[PDB]
Amino acid sequence: DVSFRLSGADPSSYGMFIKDLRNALPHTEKVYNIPLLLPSVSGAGRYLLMHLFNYDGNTITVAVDVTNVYIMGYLALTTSYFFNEPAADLASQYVFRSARRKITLPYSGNYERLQIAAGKPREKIPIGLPALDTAISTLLHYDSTAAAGALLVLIQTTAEAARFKYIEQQIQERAYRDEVPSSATISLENSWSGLSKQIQLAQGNNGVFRTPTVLVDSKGNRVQITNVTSNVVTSNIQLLLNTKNI
């Protein structure tokens, strides 16, 4: 399991949690020095449990698929909540079985679905460590509209940060003040599957992407990523979704 406490959290302790999260995901291979997530894992071992504590010390446990860093569901006191999707229903067979009751949330884990439930795109939702404290608090008591926004915060501040060092840095900058994600942050989240695929296809193509990935940069400019020498590949990306899952 991995854990993160909001009480006394700073850029350093958050960085430790994101390091722990990445290190908890198994890999047998690196591709261009980036860990390659497994094609699949059997049984309960497919799921990592993240123990998150809000500032008051209340806690949720979040179940994450170790093959793709997808959040499947979470446990809050004696109630489990899972996304309305086959993968999460499958997860519910393995985690939080001791919950007194299981609620299936009225949406899948998809960004598009979550944003419609929440009533806003994530361009408009501040993120940061204070937002993560709120999100844990919200998830503690069922409210499906509020939970969509909380889950948008949770997914980006955990999974997306694990995936991209840039996104981790954006959250560290937001340790004590929330701010909507940069255009670059949104771009990277949206491109993780694409990047993961092209980095793996580069392996037999002399480091060259079969298809260029379009991203927005730090100054908010649209750039073409064509090969593994790009900073996105050498510095930024920390985990590759296996092409078997693309």
Ligand X SMILES: C[n+]1cn([C@@H]2O[C@H](COP(=O)(O)OP(=O)(O)O)[C@@H](O)[C@H]2O)c2nc(N)[nH]c(=O)c21
Ligand Y SMILES: *[C@@H]1O[C@H](CO)[C@@H](O)[C@H](O)[C@H]1NC(C)=O
**Which spans of this chain sit near ligand X (rule: CB under 6 A)?**
70-72, 83, 85, 87-88, 108-112, 155, 159, 189-190, 193
Considering CB distances under 5 to 8 angstroms, the limit depending on partner class, which of ligand X, ligand Y, none binds residue 155?
ligand X
The residues near 90 (Cβ < 8 Å, ≥ 6 apart) are none
**Residue 230 sits in the site that holds ligand Y (CB under 6 A):** yes
Considering CB distances under 5 to 8 angstroms, the limit depending on partner class, which of ligand X, ligand Y, none binds residue 237?
none
Shortest Cβ 105–ligand X spacing (Å)? 10
Considering CB distances under 5 to 8 angstroms, the limit depending on partner class, which of ligand X, ligand Y, none binds residue 216?
none
Among 113-121, 126-134, 138-146, 226-234, the segment contacting ligand Y (CB under 6 A): 226-234
Q: What are phi and psi of 34, to 5 degrees?
A: -110, 125
Taking a C-beta distance cutoff of 8 angstroms, is the pair 175, 128 a contact? yes
**Residue 229 sits in the site that holds ligand Y (CB under 6 A):** yes
Packing angle, helices 11-23 and 165-173, rounded to 10: 150
Residue 190 is assigned to a ligand binding site: no
- Placement of tokens 């593994």 in the chain: 228
Shortest Cβ 190–ligand X spacing (Å)? 5
- Alpha-carbon torsion 24, 27, 29, 34, what sign? negative
**Residue 191 sits in the site that holds ligand Y (CB under 6 A):** no
Residue length of the chain: 246
Buried-state track 188-215, b at ≥16 Cβ within 10 A, e below 16: bbebbbbbbbbbbebeeeeeebeeebeb
Per-residue x/- track, 80-109, ligand Y (CB under 6 A): ------------------------------
- Placement of tokens 């990277």 in the chain: 188
Per-residue x/- track, 105-144, ligand Y (CB under 6 A): ----------------------------------------
- Placement of tokens 């399991």 in the chain: 1
Q: 101-104 and 79-82 as β-strands: parallel, antiparallel, unpaired?
A: parallel
Residue 69 is assigned to a ligand binding site: yes
Buried-state track 59-95, b at ≥16 Cβ within 10 A, e below 16: bbbbbbbbbbbbbbbbbbeebbbbbebebbeebbeeb
Residues involved in catalysis: 160
Shortest Cβ 224–ligand Y spacing (Å)? 9
Considering CB distances under 5 to 8 angstroms, the limit depending on partner class, which of ligand X, ligand Y, none binds residue 227?
ligand Y
Using CB under 6 A, pick the residue from 24, 99, 180, 208 that binds ligand Y.
Answer: 208
- Judged by the rule CB under 6 A, the positions of this chain that interact with ligand Y are 208, 226-227, 229-230
Residue numbering of the annotated binding site for adenine? 70-71, 109
Residue numbering of the annotated binding site for CDP? 70-71, 85, 110-112, 163
